[PDB]
PDB file of C-alpha atoms and ligand atoms in Angstrom:
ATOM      1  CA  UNK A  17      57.331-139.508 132.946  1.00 18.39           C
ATOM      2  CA  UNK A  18      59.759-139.531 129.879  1.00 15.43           C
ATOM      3  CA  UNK A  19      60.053-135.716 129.637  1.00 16.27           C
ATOM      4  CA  UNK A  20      62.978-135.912 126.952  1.00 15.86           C
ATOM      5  CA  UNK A  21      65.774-137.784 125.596  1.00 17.18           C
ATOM      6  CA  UNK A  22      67.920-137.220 129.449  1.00 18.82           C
ATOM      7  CA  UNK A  23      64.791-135.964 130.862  1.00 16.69           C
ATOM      8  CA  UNK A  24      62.533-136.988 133.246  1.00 16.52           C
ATOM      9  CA  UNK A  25      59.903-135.876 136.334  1.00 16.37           C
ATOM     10  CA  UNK A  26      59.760-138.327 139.623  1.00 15.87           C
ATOM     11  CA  UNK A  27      56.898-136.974 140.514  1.00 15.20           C
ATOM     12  CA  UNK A  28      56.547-136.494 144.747  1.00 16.22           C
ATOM     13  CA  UNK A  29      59.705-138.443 144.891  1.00 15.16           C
ATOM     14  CA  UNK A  30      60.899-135.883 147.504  1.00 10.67           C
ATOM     15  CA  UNK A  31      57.664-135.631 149.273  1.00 14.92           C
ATOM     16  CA  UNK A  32      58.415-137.874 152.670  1.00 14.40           C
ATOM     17  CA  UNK A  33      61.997-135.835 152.537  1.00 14.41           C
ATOM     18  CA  UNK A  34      60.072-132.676 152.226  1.00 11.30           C
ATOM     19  CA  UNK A  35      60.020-131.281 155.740  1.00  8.10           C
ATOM     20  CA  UNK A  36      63.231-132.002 156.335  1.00  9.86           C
ATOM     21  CA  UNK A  37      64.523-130.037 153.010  1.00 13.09           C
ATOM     22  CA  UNK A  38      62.453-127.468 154.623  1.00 10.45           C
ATOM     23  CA  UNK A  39      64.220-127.299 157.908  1.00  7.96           C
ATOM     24  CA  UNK A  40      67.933-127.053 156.332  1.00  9.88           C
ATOM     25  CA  UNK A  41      66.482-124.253 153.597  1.00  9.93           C
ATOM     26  CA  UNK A  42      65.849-122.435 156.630  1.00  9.46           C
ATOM     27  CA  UNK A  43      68.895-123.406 158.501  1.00 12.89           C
ATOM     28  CA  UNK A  44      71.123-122.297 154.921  1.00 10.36           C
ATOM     29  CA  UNK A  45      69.229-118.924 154.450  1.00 10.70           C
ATOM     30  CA  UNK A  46      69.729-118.056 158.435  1.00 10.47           C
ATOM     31  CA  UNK A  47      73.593-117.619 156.992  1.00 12.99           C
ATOM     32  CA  UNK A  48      73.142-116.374 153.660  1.00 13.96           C
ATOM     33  CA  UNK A  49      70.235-114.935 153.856  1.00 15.40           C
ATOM     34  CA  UNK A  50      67.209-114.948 150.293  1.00 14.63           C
ATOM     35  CA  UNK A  51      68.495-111.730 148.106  1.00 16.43           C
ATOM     36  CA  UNK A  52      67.115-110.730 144.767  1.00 16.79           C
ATOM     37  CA  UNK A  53      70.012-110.157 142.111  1.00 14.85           C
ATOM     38  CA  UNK A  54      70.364-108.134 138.974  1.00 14.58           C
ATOM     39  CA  UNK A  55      71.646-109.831 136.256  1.00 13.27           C
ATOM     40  CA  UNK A  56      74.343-108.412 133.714  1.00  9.30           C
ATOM     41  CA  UNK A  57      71.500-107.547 131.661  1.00  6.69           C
ATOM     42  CA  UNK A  58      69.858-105.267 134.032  1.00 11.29           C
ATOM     43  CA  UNK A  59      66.956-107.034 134.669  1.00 10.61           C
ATOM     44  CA  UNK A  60      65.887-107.409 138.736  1.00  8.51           C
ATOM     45  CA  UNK A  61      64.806-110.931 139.686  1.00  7.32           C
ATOM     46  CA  UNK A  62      61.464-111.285 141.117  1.00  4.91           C
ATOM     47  CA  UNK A  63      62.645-115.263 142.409  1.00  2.00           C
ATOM     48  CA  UNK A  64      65.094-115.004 145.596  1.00  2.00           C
ATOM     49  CA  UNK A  65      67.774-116.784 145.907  1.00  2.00           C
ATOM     50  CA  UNK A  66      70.763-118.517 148.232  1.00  2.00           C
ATOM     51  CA  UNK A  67      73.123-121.329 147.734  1.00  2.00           C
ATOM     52  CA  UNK A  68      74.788-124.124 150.111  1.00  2.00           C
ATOM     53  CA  UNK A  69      77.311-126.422 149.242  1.00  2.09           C
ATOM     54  CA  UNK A  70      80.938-125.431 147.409  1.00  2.00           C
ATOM     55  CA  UNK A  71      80.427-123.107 145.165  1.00  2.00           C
ATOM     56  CA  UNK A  72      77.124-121.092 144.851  1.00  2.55           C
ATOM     57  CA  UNK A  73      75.481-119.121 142.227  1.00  2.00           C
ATOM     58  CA  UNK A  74      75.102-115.063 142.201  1.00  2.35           C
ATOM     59  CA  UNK A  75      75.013-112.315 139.768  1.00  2.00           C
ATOM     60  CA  UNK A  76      74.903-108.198 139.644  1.00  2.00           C
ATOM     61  CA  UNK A  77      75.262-105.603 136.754  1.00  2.00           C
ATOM     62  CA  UNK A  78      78.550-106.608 136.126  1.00  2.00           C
ATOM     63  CA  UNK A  79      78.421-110.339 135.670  1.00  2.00           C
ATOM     64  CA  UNK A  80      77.824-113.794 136.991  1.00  2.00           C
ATOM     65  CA  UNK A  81      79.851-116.027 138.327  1.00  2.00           C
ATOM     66  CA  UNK A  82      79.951-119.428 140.652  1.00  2.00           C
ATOM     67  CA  UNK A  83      81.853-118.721 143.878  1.00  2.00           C
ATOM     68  CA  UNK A  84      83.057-120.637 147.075  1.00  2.00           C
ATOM     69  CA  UNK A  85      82.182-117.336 148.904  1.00  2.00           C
ATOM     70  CA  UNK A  86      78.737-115.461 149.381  1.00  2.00           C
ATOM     71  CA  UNK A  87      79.588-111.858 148.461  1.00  2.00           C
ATOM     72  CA  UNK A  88      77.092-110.675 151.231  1.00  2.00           C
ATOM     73  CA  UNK A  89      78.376-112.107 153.869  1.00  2.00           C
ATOM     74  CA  UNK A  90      81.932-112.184 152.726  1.00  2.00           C
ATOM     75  CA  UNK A  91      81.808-115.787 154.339  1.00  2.00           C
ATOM     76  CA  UNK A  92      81.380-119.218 152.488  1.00  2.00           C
ATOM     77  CA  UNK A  93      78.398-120.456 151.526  1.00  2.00           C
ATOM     78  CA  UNK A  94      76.720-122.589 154.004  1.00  2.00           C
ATOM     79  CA  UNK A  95      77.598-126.670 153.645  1.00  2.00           C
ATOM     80  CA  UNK A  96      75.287-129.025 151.226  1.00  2.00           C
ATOM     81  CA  UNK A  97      72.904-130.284 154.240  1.00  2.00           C
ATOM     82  CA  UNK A  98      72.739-134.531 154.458  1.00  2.00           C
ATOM     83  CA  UNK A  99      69.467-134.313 154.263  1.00  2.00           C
ATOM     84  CA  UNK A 100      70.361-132.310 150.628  1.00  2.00           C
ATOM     85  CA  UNK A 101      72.962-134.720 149.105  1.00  2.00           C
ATOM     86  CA  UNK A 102      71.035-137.519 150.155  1.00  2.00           C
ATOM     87  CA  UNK A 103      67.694-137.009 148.174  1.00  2.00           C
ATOM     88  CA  UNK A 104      69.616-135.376 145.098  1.00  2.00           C
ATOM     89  CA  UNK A 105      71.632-138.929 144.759  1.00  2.00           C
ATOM     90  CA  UNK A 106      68.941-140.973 145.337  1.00  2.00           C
ATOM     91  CA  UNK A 107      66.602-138.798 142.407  1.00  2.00           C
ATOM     92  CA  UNK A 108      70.096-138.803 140.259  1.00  2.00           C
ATOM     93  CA  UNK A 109      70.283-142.291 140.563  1.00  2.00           C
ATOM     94  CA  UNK A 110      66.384-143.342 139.570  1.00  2.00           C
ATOM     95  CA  UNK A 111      66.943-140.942 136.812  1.00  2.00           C
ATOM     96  CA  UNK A 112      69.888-142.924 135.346  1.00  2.00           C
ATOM     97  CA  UNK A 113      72.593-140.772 136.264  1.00  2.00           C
ATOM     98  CA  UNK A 114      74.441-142.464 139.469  1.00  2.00           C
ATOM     99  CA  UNK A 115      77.586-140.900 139.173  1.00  2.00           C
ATOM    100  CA  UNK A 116      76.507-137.427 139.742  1.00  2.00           C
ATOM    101  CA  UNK A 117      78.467-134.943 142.153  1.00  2.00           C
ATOM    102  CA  UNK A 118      77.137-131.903 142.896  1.00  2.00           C
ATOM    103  CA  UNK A 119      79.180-129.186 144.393  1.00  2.00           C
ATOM    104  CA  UNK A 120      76.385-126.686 144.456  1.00  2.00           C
ATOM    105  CA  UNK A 121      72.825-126.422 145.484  1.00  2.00           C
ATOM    106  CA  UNK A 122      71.026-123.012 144.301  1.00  2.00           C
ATOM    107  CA  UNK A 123      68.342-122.430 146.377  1.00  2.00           C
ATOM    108  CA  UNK A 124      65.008-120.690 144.717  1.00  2.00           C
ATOM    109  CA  UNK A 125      62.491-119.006 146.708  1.00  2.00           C
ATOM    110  CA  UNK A 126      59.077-117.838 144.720  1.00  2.00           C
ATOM    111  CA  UNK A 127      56.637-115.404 146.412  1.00  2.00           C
ATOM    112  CA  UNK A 128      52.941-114.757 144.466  1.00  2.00           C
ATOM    113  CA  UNK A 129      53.478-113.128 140.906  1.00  2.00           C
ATOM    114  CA  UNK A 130      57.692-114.642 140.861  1.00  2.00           C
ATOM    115  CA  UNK A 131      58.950-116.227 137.914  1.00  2.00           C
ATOM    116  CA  UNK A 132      62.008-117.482 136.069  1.00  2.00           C
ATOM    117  CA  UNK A 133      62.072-115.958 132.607  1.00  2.00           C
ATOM    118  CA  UNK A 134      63.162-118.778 129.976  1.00  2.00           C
ATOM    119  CA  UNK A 135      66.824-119.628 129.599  1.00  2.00           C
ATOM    120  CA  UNK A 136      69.768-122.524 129.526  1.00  2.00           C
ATOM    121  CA  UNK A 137      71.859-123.536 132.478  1.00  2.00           C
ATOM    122  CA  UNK A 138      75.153-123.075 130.351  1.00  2.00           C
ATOM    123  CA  UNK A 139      77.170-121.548 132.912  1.00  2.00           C
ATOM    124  CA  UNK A 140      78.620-124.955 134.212  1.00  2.00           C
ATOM    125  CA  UNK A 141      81.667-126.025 132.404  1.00  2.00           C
ATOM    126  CA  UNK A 142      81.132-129.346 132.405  1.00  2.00           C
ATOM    127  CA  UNK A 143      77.887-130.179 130.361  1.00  2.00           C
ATOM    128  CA  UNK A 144      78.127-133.844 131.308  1.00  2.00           C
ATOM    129  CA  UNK A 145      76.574-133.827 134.765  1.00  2.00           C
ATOM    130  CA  UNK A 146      72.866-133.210 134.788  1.00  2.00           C
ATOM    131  CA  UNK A 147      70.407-131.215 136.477  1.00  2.00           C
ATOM    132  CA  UNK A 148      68.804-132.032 139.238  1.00  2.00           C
ATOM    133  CA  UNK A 149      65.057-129.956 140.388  1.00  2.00           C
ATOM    134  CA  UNK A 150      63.702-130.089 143.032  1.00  2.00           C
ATOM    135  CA  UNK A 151      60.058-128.522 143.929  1.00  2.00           C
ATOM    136  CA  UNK A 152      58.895-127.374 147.518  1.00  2.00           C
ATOM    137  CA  UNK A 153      55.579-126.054 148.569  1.00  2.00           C
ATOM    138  CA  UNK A 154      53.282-124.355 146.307  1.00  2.00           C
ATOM    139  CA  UNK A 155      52.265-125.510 142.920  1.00  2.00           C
ATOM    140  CA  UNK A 156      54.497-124.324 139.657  1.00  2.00           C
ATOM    141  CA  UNK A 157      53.921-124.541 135.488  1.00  2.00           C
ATOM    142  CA  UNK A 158      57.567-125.147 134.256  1.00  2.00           C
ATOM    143  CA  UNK A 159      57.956-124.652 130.685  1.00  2.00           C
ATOM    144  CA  UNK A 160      60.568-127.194 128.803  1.00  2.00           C
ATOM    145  CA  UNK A 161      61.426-126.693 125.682  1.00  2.00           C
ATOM    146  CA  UNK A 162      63.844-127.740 123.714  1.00  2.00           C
ATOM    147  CA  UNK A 163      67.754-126.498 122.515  1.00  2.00           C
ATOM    148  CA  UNK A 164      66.406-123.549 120.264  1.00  2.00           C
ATOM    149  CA  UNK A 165      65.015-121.018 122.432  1.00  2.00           C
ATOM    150  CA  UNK A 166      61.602-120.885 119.885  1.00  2.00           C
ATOM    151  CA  UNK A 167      61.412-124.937 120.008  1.00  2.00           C
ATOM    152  CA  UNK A 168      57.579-125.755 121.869  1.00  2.00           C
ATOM    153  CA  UNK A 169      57.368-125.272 125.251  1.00  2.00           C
ATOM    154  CA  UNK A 170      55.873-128.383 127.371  1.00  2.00           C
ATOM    155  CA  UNK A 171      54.396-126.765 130.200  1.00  2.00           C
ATOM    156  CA  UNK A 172      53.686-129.068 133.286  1.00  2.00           C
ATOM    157  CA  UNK A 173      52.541-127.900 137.096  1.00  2.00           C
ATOM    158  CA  UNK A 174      55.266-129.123 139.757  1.00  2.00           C
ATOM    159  CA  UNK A 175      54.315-130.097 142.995  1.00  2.00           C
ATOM    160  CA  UNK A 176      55.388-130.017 146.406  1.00  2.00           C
ATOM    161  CA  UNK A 177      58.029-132.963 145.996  1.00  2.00           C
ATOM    162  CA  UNK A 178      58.335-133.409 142.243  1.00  2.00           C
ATOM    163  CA  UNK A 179      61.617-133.979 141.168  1.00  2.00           C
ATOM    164  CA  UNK A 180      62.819-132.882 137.393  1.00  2.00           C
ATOM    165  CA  UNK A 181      66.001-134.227 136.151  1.00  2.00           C
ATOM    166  CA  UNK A 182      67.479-133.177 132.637  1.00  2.00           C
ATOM    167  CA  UNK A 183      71.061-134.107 130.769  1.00  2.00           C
ATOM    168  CA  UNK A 184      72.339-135.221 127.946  1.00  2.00           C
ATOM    169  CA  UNK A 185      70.999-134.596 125.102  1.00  2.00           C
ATOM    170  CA  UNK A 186      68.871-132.187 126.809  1.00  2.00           C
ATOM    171  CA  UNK A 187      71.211-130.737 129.129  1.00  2.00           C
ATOM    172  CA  UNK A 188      70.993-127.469 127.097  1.00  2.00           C
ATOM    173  CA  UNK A 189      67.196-127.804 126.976  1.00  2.00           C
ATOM    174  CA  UNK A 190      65.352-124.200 127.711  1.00  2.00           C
ATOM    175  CA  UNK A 191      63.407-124.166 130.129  1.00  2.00           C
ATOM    176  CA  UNK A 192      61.465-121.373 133.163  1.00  2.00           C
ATOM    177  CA  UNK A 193      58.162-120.869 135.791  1.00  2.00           C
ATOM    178  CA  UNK A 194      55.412-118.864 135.257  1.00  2.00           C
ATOM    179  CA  UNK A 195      54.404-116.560 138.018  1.00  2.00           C
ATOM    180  CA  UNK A 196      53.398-118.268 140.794  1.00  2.00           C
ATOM    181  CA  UNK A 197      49.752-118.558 142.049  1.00  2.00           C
ATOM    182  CA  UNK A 198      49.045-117.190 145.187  1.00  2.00           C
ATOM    183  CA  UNK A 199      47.837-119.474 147.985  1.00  2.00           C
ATOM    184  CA  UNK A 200      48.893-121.593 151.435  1.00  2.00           C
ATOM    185  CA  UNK A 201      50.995-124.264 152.144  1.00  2.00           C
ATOM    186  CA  UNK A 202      51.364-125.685 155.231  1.00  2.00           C
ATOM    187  CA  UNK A 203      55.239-126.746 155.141  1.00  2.00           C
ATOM    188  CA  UNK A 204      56.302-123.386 153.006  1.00  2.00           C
ATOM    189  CA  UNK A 205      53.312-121.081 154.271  1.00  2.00           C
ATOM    190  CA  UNK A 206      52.889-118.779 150.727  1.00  2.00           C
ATOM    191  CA  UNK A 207      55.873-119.203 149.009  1.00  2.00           C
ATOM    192  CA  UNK A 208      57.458-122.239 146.704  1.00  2.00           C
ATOM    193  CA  UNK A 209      61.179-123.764 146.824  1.00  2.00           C
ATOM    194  CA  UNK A 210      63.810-125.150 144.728  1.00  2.00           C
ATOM    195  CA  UNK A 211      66.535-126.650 145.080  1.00  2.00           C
ATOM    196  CA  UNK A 212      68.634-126.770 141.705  1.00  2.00           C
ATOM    197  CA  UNK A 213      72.022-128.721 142.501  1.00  2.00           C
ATOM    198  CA  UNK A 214      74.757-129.479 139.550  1.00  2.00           C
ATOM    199  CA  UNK A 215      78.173-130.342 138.930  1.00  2.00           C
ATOM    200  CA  UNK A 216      79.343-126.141 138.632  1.00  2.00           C
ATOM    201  CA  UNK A 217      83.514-126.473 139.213  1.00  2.00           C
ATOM    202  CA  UNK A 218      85.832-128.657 137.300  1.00  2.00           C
ATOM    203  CA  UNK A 219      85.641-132.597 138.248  1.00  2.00           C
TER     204      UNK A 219
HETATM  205  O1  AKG B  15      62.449-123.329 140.050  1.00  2.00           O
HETATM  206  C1  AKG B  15      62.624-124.151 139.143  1.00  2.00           C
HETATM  207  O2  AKG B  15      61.882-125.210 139.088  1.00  2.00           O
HETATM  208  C2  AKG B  15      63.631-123.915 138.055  1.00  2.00           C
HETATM  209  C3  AKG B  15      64.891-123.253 138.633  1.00  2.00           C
HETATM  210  C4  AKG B  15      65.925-123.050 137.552  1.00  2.00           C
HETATM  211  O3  AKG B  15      65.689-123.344 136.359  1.00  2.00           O
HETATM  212  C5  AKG B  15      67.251-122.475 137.869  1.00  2.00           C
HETATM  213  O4  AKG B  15      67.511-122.025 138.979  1.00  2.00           O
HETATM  214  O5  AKG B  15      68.102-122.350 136.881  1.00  2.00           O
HETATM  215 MN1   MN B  16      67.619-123.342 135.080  1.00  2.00          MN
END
């Protein structure tokens, strides 16, 4: 589905890939473990979080920043698994964008009631290189707006292997979850995934 101009949702394009993604979230959070950060704002994060590849996402009172190292462990973020850079260039690629790098993968973890308040990924320098969503496990409504933050909000469920890519023109788009529903999934047991991987460091 054409989502927006840059936009659009393979839906359960990551489905057959979906236990393996499972197995390396796993295998990533066993090194850097899930944590749930304050941002500079002072607002606690009800969605967990991790990172694997080069440089991974965190954020405390103080600030935000992208980072080769996890400040937890004081050691580098786990490697982007195959299993990782192989779907996210195969979804980049049926979503028009083939020449996509990514040199991080944030990894989301939602427990009942968790949610991603509404807000831009404008932290990555580069603004060319899309983003690339990936949904694991329980269902999700995403909201996706538009560049204002009071444009109208689309608001779609995600499923366990939907893949939502965004850029260009809508790079800048706003966009969240609503707190997740409570329930059971066999591959994730009560909790939903993503994986959000972009282009965060100079290219
Ligand atoms: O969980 C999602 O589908 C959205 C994640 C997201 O927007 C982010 O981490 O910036
Ligand atoms: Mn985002």
């Amino acid at each position: 589905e054409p989502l927006a101009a840059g936009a659009v949702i393979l839906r359960r394009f990551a489905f057959n890939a979906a236990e393996q993604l499972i197995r390396d979230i796993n295998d990533v959070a066993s090194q850097s473990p899930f944590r749930q950060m304050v941002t500079p704002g002072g607002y606690t994060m009800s969605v967990a979080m991790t990172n694997c590849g080069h440089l991974g996402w965190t954020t405390h009172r103080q600030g935000y920043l992208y980072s080769p190292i996890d400040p937890q462990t004081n050691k580098p973020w786990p490697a982007m698994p195959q299993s990782f850079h192989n779907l996210c260039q195969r979804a980049a690629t049926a979503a028009g964008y083939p020449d996509f790098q990514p040199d991080a993968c944030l990894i989301n973890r939602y427990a009942p009631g968790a949610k991603l308040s509404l807000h831009q990924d404008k932290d990555e320098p580069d603004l060319r290189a899309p983003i690339v969503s990936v949904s694991l496990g329980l269902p999700a409504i995403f909201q996706f707006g538009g560049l204002k933050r009071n444009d109208p909000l689309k608001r779609l469920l995600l499923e366990h292997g939907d893949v939502v890519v965004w850029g260009g023109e809508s790079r800048l788009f706003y966009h969240g979850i609503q707190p997740l529903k409570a329930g059971f999934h066999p591959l994730t047991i009560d909790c939903r995934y993503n994986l959000t991987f972009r282009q965060a460091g100079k290219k």
